[PDB]
Write a protein that binds this ligand. Structure first.
Ligand SMILES: CC(=O)N[C@@H]1[C@@H](O)[C@H](O)[C@@H](COP(=O)(O)O)O[C@H]1O
Ligand SMILES: CC(=O)N[C@@H]1[C@@H](O)[C@H](O)[C@@H](COP(=O)(O)O)O[C@H]1O
Ligand SMILES: [Cl-]
Ligand SMILES: [K+]
Ligand SMILES: [K+]
Ligand SMILES: [Zn+2]
Ligand SMILES: [Zn+2]
Ligand SMILES: [Zn+2]
Ligand SMILES: [Zn+2]
Lengths: 306, 303
């Protein structure tokens, strides 16, 4: 008999990342199916397919932990997923507990990322860890003394739904700054600026060409003028926004995840640009790239059931 | 054992002595001597010696300061006390008083003492907010203060106005106030009792005190009513941003402006529009130890 198997899902806009971990926490399955962002019955279908297929492959009933890009209402279980309008308002935990006939744990994706990153031996004893996801949206997971702070209403770490601070707006032209609409239905949330999507939207606003983030970064590496101006602006915008956040939270370690965390220039430029925007006595946190690559979410979700 | 706590203020120095059972047995209140650093130091030193002489012992010394002691050098950054800026307070006092001294941020001390109240025992998180000469925060998670990598945790006063607050204040026409930290537009200069006054004076060109403006508001005077409506909305917008980041279970307000009772009625009404749809309000309460939370938290550093 296989024993206990822990399944984790990291749900994104585009793909559902699935992982199965055995009794020793060795990853023994890895799947990536398309995220159905049309039907909700189909979104459920994808999740449900993955668990049953894995059930049949190892011949067990795995536990199910799910990391979602949003929040499950603490009273109703209904989802708020700002960059997934498909899933908005659904009782995901109950609906999956129905279809799968077992308990399901649901947590925010950045919380799961921060939890798994902070449980690494090098970080487990740090007094605080901030996990930041820069993907389709901007999300945070807050760990204090090794325990996730999920907040009054599962909102802790929702830095993506804070508005651009004055010094960022000044950088972007003040009354001429682009004010992007947000999936939360507010406007000017940093979710729409510091994410990989926001990086792209800012380029398009200033330069009127809809390039992807990888394309803009390749142009930057060739020293192309528009991309260089964009990247300079973006690095300063990211430093200003993070300096504000760090003046509030003052984390010991910041771990970055999501697609835009692979832009290596970030780790060189933040330490240079942050000091101007921090208090005189501030000391920089250690700012590091995710140590589990793109798997932090899957692992943290699986490990909810530990 | 006698435990001394000092809460050092923009305006005044609060002193308290707690006996072995933690009963408050001394209370003194001197003005904060913010002209000279010699005079600042002297006041603290006077209060310890006087209390030493009165109870005939050498009590422990915990101090809550409106600022940060550099984690590496011990030098102070006190944005609204230019007198103390740059000084090695802990070592200077340990010299003059010939015993160890603990130094912590004033809002940290306030939050710690408020969070250890029986009513708040077991809350997963507490945010203590000081709205005084400046704006300060103390973050408590599972009963323990998070002081941060460099003793900056909870420095929400030195975050800049968010876009929705600037829009409320006129965007490119919004007043951008200079800050004691040497940045500009920090909320320290807007949501504090001082900032409340500076916003009134910017819009109405009269330098009234916060109590005077509030009294005029209570009479229904037009300028004060406009100001208070603007202020309440500004406070809700700024705190909604902060609560979307921190999502605290309980928010305890302290400092002079926490006595403006309208705040407890208006925040719950005005916060929801600016929070996420699934946000639930934190319990928003007035300090349960009145003006003593800082003194008690400071004293109890040495517990
Ligand atoms: C209220 C909300 O929906 N906030 C979400 C936040 O919960 C989430 O952690 C963050 C990052 O997620 P992503 O993997 O890029 O899709 O995206 C924000 O927009
Ligand atoms: C960098 C700094 O000086 N920040 C301070 C902060 O540490 C402090 O908690 C806050 C409140 O203090 P107050 O009782 O009004 O005099 O005032 C802010 O200005
Ligand atoms: Cl004060
Ligand atoms: K989060
Ligand atoms: K603080
Ligand atoms: Zn938003
Ligand atoms: Zn190209
Ligand atoms: Zn400041
Ligand atoms: Zn008057």
């Amino acid at each position: 008999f296989q024993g206990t198997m822990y399944y984790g899902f990291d749900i994104g806009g585009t793909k559902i990342e699935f992982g199965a971990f055995d009794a020793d926490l060795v990853r023994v399955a890895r799947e990536r199916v398309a995220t159905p962002t049309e039907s909700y019955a189909a979104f459920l279908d994808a999740i449900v397919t993955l668990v049953n297929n894995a059930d049949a492959e190892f011949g067990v009933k795995g536990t199910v932990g799910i990391g979602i890009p949003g929040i499950a209402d603490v009273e109703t279980g209904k989802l708020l997923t700002s960059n997934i309008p498909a899933a908005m308002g659904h009782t995901l935990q109950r609906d999956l507990e129905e279809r799968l006939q077992r308990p399901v744990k649901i947590e925010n994706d950045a919380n799961c990322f921060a939890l798994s990153e902070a449980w690494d031996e090098d970080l487990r004893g740090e007094p605080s860890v901030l996990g930041l996801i820069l993907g389709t949206g901007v999300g945070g997971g807050l760990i204090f003394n090794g325990k996730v702070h999920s907040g009054r209403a599962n909102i802790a770490g929702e830095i993506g739904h804070t508005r651009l601070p004055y010094d960022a707006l000044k950088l972007l032209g003040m009354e001429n700054a682009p004010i992007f609409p947000c999936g939360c239905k507010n406007s000017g949330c940093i979710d729409n600026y510091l994410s990989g999507r926001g990086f792209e939207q800012l380029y398009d606003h200033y330069f009127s060409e809809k390039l992807s983030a990888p394309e803009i970064i390749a142009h930057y590496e060739q020293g192309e003028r528009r991309a260089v101006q964009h990247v300079e602006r973006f690095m300063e915008l990211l430093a200003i926004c993070l300096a504000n956040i760090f003046t509030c939270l003052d984390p010991h370690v910041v771990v970055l995840g999501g697609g835009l965390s692979n832009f290596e220039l970030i780790y060189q430029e933040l330490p240079k640009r942050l000091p101007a925007h921090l208090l005189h006595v501030a000391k920089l946190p250690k700012i590091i790239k995710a140590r589990h690559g793109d798997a932090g979410g899957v692992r943290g979700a699986a490990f909810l059931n530990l």
